[PDB]
Design a protein around this nucleic acid. Sequence first.
DNA 1: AAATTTGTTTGAAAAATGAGCAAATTT
DNA 2: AAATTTGCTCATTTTTCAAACAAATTT
Lengths: 91, 98
Amino acid sequence: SDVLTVSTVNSQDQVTQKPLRDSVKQALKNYFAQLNGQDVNDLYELVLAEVEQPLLDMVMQYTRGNQTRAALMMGINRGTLRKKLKKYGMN
Amino acid sequence: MFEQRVNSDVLTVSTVNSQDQVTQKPLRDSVKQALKNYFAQLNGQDVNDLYELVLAEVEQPLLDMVMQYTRGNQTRAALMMGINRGTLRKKLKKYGMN
DNA sequence: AAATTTGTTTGAAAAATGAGCAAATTT
DNA sequence: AAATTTGCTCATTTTTCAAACAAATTT
């Protein structure tokens, strides 16, 4: 029912799937705890950065560096794709 | 002084190692495995909307978690994410969060 | 009773789109 | 030699933005 998941082991030594979103939720549950008052200026860019990099890296591994199949696979414009690659300096 | 914390280490998750020890690893790596897994299962089939799929799985808990933190305040939340207050409100309606 | 936030509108700036093309590169 | 992708434009559509400002709610 839910296509993006990650692997998990319990004390009885059994492996089992759970959603990526539960990890994102943990990460952040953790970010906030380890802050006290200190404000946060721009978290939407931060998390986006942390998620766009391993997406781009993984599809360019998969499409063998084919920028055109990549873009089509993601549903974004071929120019958009170049631009984001430039943002992260992987080209 | 203060020890250096790279950005890869600002958002992390609990993992268990080959010596059965508990330990923190980047969210980055959770996102890799998720997709690495997604592909193996895909097996030959095609896609046309992977950006929107990943974007969704990630926007939804980021939004959820931030509103709990500002006890529902949409002005501070949008300020603390650093996005327009009307894009936030737009974005929330998309996921049914109101 | 203040001060702050929500629910709207409006118009301008920035980003994303599709379509074109010659030169380079893979098939 | 032919087919396909790159690198670079243009210009139009869509999304994001800040600045209004009543009316509603929280301090």
